[PDB]
DNA sequence: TGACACGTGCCTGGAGACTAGGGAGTAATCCCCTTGGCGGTTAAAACGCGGGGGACAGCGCGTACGTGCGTTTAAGCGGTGCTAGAGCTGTCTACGACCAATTGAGCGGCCTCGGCACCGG
DNA sequence: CCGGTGCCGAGGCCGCTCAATTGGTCGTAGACAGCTCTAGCACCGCTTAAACGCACGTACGCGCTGTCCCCCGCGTTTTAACCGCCAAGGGGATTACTCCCTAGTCTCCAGGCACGTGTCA
């Protein structure tokens, strides 16, 4: 299932697109495809953040956990 | 407030699926920034492909190909 | 300069190769290339382990730090 | 001595110094050796495969670059 | 017509018959195509890599055998 | 006697290769080698799929059968 | 942690070895290595059997499930 | 004989670690047969390496080499 | 030649086998709606004959590019002992931010109508 | 030279789901000191580094033969896709039949650990 709501996600995708290209069209199956990928990416990122929290013998994830996880993965920020 | 449509309980639910038991209040602003960057990058490539093919229509396969090549 | 000793590194490389295929001889520039890659990889791994150590309010890296760094990148 | 022991403790320390760490636990050294071996095994396995494809008996620099590329990602 | 559609419905059925399958659900065909594409992509990616290592412009039968081995037959 | 049609399989193979490297020529015996391997792979997968169908007392194979076979073999699924 | 007791595991390993070769012995770290591998293998095999059970209209794993799992893996 | 030394509760424990919810009574005898085969194969290779090196003491590395070629 | 594993003793709670016992979870059974299988068929994309080129792999050979042996050695570097300095943790006290129960309030969703491009036959 | 289709854009109404309030409080931030431990100094031994030397293993480059890939006319050609009737079955609910998982009890024992000893790295 899609844990993120469909309609606000679609609006965001269209919002981001307006800055790259004016009035560009989309497809319905394209947004659903992007969302499955997006949710998998965020869930995976949350997995790594949790690993960082556990490494510090804590159970609460903090901003520093997200930043550590993305830096070691090689994600530029 | 279209960025605000990714609500706090939704992000918490995503974290639960990721195995998160406790969630700091500051996570939400941080996650939103991270999400925005991801979307920008994928869409930037997706639109590039559309323009290269002179089609002007984003196809589902274009996004899937963009996503695949992003992970590599 | 390469931080790993050249001759012992070369000996190790030849030993591992002998089990995949016997009697192979390595080109010199091939071993130096392999060594540059290895040292770059280890240095990068040491960067990430240190970030994990500092994250945990420590300054000394430990085996659990190395294992975390390799796990989040997707090595194991 | 064993050939895995030729990556000496001061060598591993130097690699760690270049990695930005100030102090290194005693257990790091054995851990680092294991990690290196796994990496080396994988690369060399691919490297030797390339050598056989080219019908050569000498692993060349070009063999390593292809091995590294497929393991680099 | 799309080239993935050339793996026709009766062809996939014949493969399943050879595999001992007597009846085949309608959803099998799309599933089989996806599986096939993933397999093909992986093999060809390695195959083309071998071709480039040999500094050739024509992928050879030998290229495929090495590609298949590293995939696992 | 290959079970997949020769010409469409060859066309598919060339299409995928163009995305890895453009302007490549395929040897005939290379494509025949690749095709023999692919058909053996699919037949073998269908053998295991059939075993999964019989396991569930269903004479008809379904997508869940293919997905189970590939997961137990160790293929990414 | 090891899930099978050392001494019964050791007896089985020694029993099998006695049939393969006369009077061969094993190092302590060798048996612990074999046991870690053995426990990982059984856990993995139990994962697949359970997956096979869930595929069928049941949640209880049966002898026929393991044999199917091992057949598809290419073992037996 | 020796397979009967391995306890019924241990195999149940293994299934819990494998994420198994319930266990049929007939699994245990079946599991024992499967286990014996695995060990034989691994040990057969281990002893082969020992004999190739003309040694009489099985080393930890011998098992690891046997294990690698079995898993591969 | 000395260190390692083999063999046995003492024991005690951890762990392992029956013996009742409730029952979640197996296994036949019917009807139905789904839904592939199979029969017709015809246009058609695949199979193929063959000229035609010709780009390009396969093969042989010269040679120099370089790997292996190995041999000494002066020498920078690793190993080991020892020390004094710094860092890895528990339980101290506390707080504040993170958890949840409750209530308006609003946006998500189902189903549908009206208008605009748009690649296309 | 015009067309069926996918699209936004909105609406009508139900409809679950938010932010905010308030409270209970779990967990996280310094930290003192016991503890490990390790970074560094100082020898001392030693194994890397190197330069010939010589011997040659062979990789790279280049040219020649082949041969097989690409192309396509284009001819014929076995057949894939579609419609539709037919019959096998997936399955959901029904219901009989458990043995599988718990507790209690009695017993077997895994391992520290210690001593004595044969054997090969």
Domains in chain A with CATH codes: 1-77 (1.10.20.10)
Resolution in A: 3.9
Helix (H, G, I), strand (E, B) or coil at H5: helix
Neighbours of chain D (3+ CB pairs under 8 A): C, E
Strand nucleotide closest to residue F25 (CA to C1'): J69
CA D25 to C1' J39 (Å) is 11
Q: How many CB atoms lie within 10 A of CB D60?
A: 18
Cβ pair A15, C15 in contact under 8 A: no
Determine phi and psi for G60, rounding to 5 degrees.
-110, 125
- Phi/psi at A61 (nearest 5 deg)? -80, 145
Distance CA G44, CA G51 (A): 11
Q: What is the 3 state secondary structure string of B18-59?
A: CCCCEECCCHHHHHHHHHHHHHHHHHHHHHHHHHHCCCCECC
Q: Per-residue b/e over F61-76, b at no fewer than 16 CB within 10 Å? A: bbbbbbbbbbbbbeee
> For the stretch B11-47, what's the b/e string if a residue is b when 16 or more beta carbons lie within 10 angstroms of its beta carbon?
beebbeebebeebeeebeebbeebbeebbeebbebbb
Distance CA A21, CA B56 (A): 10
CA dihedral F8, F13, F17, F18 (to 10 degrees): 0
Dist. CA A27–CA A22, nearest whole Å: 16
Give the total residue count for chain D.
Answer: 73
Name the nucleotide with the smallest C1'–CA separation from C56: I88
Question: Is the Cβ pair A3, B58 closer than 8 Å?
Answer: no
CA distances from G41 to D18, E19, G15, H69 (A): 39, 29, 20, 14
Q: In angstroms, rounded to a whole number, what is the distance separating the alpha carbons of residues C70 and D32?
A: 12
d(CA C40, CA C73): 16
The residues pairing with D21 across neighbouring beta strands, listed in sequence order, are: none
From the list A47, H68, F16, the residue with the least C-alpha distance to D45 is H68
Question: What is the maximal distance between C-alpha atoms in chain D?
Answer: 47
CB within 8 Å: F16 and E40: yes
Beta-carbon count within 10 A of C50 CB: 21
Q: Helix, strand or coil for residue G47? A: helix
Q: Which nucleotides of I are covered by protein (CB under 7 A)?
A: 4-6, 15-17, 25-27, 35-37, 45-48, 55-58, 66-68, 77-79, 87-89, 97-99, 107-109, 119
Taking each continuous run of H as one helix and of E as one strand, the counts in chain H are 3, 2
Distance spanning both ends of chain F, measured CA to CA: 31
- Please name which of H11, E22, G76, A59 lies closest in space to residue B24, comparing C-alpha atoms: A59
Q: Which residues of D touch E71 (CB under 8 A)?
A: none
Closest of F7, H32, D40, H31 to residue G16, by C-alpha: H32
Nearest to E33 by CA among E65, E3, E72, E68: E3
Apex A63 CA angle, A57 and A65, nearest 5: 40
Pick the closest to residue C16 from H68, D56, D62 (CA basis): H68
Question: Are the Cβ atoms of E21 and F29 closer than 8 angstroms?
Answer: no
Distance from CA of C34 to the nearest CA of A (A): 22
Q: Are F3 and E10 a contacting pair, CB within 8 Å?
A: no
A64: left (phi over 0), alpha (psi -120 to 50) or beta: alpha
Query: In chain D, what are the domain boundaries?
Result: 1-73
Integer Cα distance of B45 and B67 in angstroms? 9
Q: Is the dihedral of CA D45, D46, D47, D52 positive or negative?
A: positive
Evaluate whether G52 touches G69 at the Cβ level (below 8 Å): yes
Would you say C9 and D44 are in contact if contact means Cβ atoms under 8 Å apart?
no
Cβ of H27 within 8 Å of Cβ of G61? The answer is: yes
Chain C contact probe: residue of A45, A55, A57 with most C CBs at under 10 A: A55
Residue E40's Cβ-count burial label (10 Å; 0-12, 13-18, 19+) is buried
Q: Are G33 and F46 in contact (CB under 8 A)?
A: no
Chains H and E touch (3+ CB pairs under 8 A): no
d(CA C33, CA H9): 54
E strand residue ranges, C5-68: 25-26, 60-61
- Rounded Cα distance, F55 and F47, in Å: 12
Q: Render the burial of H19-31: b for 16+ CB within 10 Å, e for the rest.
A: ebeebeeebbebb
Report CA torsion sign: G14, G15, G20, G21. positive
Q: Which tokens is C59 given?
A: 């300054």
C-alpha span between C52 and D20 (Å, rounded): 12
CB C73 within 8 A of CB A74: yes
- Decide if domain D1-73 falls under CATH 1.10.20.10: yes
Beta bridge partners of F25: E58
Residue closest to I119, CA→C1'? B55
Does residue C21 belong to the interface with chain A, where contact is any CB pair within 8 Å?
no
Q: Taking the CA of residue F23 as centre, how many other CA atoms within 13 Å lie in the half-sphere pointing to its CB?
A: 2
**Which subunits have 3 or more CB–CB pairs within 8 Å of chain F?**
E, G
Query: In 3-state terms, what secondary structure has residue D23?
Result: strand
Q: What is the token pair recorded at B10? A: 């939704």
Angle between helices C28-55 and A63-73 (to 10 degrees): 180
Integer Cα distance of F23 and C23 in angstroms? 37
Q: Who contacts A28 (Cβ-Cβ below 8 Å, separation ≥6)?
A: none
- For E58, the enclosing helix (H) or strand (E) is strand E58-59
Contacts of residue D25, defined as CB under 8 A and 6 or more positions apart, other chains included, come to: C60, C61, C62, C63
Nearest to C60 among D7, D23, D48 (CB): D23
CATH architecture, domain defined by H1-72: Orthogonal Bundle (1.10)
Based on its alpha-carbon atoms, the radius of gyration of chain F, rounded to whole angstroms, reads: 16
Q: What's the rounded Cα separation, in Å, for the pair D56 and C25?
A: 10
């Amino acid at each position: 299932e899609l844990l993120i709501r469909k309609l606000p996600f679609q609006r965001l995708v269209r919002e981001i697109a307006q800055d790259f290209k004016t009035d560009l069209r989309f497809q319905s199956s394209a947004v659903m495809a992007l969302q499955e990928a997006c949710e998998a990416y965020l869930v995976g990122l949350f997995e790594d953040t949790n690993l960082c929290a556990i490494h510090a013998k804590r159970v609460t994830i903090m901003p520093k956990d997200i930043q550590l996880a993305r830096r070691i993965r090689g994600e530029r920020a | 407030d279209n960025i605000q449509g990714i609500t706090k309980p939704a992000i918490r639910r995503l974290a639960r699926r990721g195995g998160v038991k406790r969630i700091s209040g500051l996570i939400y602003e941080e996650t939103r920034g991270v999400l925005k960057v991801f979307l920008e990058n994928v869409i930037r490539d997706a639109v590039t492909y559309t323009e290269h093919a002179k089609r002007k229509t984003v196809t589902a396969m274009d996004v899937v190909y963009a996503l695949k090549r992003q992970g590599r």
